[PDB]
Amino acid sequence: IVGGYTCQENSVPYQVSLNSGYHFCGGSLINDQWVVSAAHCYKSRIQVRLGEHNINVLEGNEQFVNAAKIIKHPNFDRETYNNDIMLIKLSSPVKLNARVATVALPSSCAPAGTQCLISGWGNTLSSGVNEPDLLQCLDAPLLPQADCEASSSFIITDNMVCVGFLEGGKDACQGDSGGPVVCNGELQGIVSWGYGCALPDNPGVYTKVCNYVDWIQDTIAAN
């Protein structure tokens, strides 16, 4: 997260870190045994870390659980990142508490202008790379489709939504991928891609979660 602030300890209880020897993506706990992330974060073996604040220091609230089933959306297109969503079934249910909690699936698609919270351990610089130890937070609004593409060097599909600032300075970045965009307590987006990080005229692009609620529930029921 570029231009954000350090989240209060365990204030984003649904936030998880996908680890394969190192943190490489984020995700959201949607129930005691399922995590939703981005399909581009797929790896054959993943350890999901919950209850984290400082990813490099053991604090006493962590739960590390291996992924049992890693399911990418069948129509994920790696070229365009269309349908960039993935579900992870944990090897065992986690212990839900104050520091490890679930986030609700959306009941409807949030309107442009809605204020949301984006979080992650991704890159904090608009140039170069710096991985933070502590979970970063960013309050940003959902932008209208038209305003996003106005002066950007990219276009998006109907399964994508732009969240951020057209003036730049604040944005998600590499390493935040798969992470949550929560608006009014519901998961409305998943960190997916963008041109650079925090650049003027180029807001971040996120998977529009409200378009997949049915797929999510069916998959969870069938596995």
Ligand SMILES: [Ca+2]
């Ligand atoms: Ca820790």
